[PDB]
């Protein structure tokens, strides 16, 4: 059966409004996966996001109009063939990328089936999915920040003391030869 023009408009409007508030939109090829798999992926997502994340297979035409109206650009390359969409409306989005990345891995699926998307308003490619998926926890990040911020000072001491080490290194070298 055909959908009324009004029914279609409502679906497009709803989707468009959702994409206007999401912090992540990732496009995935979910062909071949079973309902059991869908159920498991959704469960892994919910355990971490509750209702803040969704994973739904959505017809390309619908996705296109919704993205178009939400004012997105350069997404057409992500809608070639049946495509499912993973989006986050509440909570930090990084963990959802990790979840679906590790799910495809557990299922032994081609990781290129994770086509790319938009993260916090920034477009990312398929190859970049791995980058996001492997990001360390926020806590680990905060920890690393301190040493990164101290680098200049750390580098100064290392450079000055390195002048003395060069003498030691070359003397050892001369001893090495013999």
């Amino acid at each position: 059966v055909m959908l009324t023009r009004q029914q279609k408009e409502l679906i497009v409007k709803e989707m468009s409004e959702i994409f206007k508030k999401t912090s992540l939109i990732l496009f995935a090829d979910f062909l071949g996966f079973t309902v059991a798999d869908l159920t498991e992926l959704r469960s892994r997502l919910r355990e971490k996001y509750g209702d803040g994340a969704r994973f739904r297979v959505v017809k390309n035409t619908l996705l296109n109009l919704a993205l178009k109206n939400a004012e997105y650009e350069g997404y057409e390359e992500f809608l070639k063939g049946p495509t499912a969409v993973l989006y986050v409306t509440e909570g930090d989005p990084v963990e959802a990328v990790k979840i679906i990345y590790n799910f495809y891995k557990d299922k032994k699926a081609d990781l290129s089936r994770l086509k790319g998307g938009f993260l916090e308003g920034k477009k990312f490619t398929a190859e970049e999915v791995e980058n996001i998926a492997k990001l360390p926890s926020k806590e680990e990040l905060y920890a690393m920040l301190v040493g990164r911020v101290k680098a200049p000072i750390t580098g100064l001491v290392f450079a000055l003391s390195g002048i003395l080490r060069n003498l030691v290194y070359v003397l050892n070298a001369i001893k090495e030869k013999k």
Binding site: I163, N166, L167, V170, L171, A173, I174, K177
Partner: peptide, 27 residues
């Protein structure tokens, strides 16, 4: 001599030590 070596080394200016190391690295 060797302690005399270290003393001669400790008296060099950083620029002098740099040249020393430079020519030793030219081995």
């Amino acid at each position: 001599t060797i302690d005399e070596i270290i003393e001669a080394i400790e008296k060099l200016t950083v620029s002098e030590l740099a040249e020393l190391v430079k020519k030793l690295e030219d081995k």
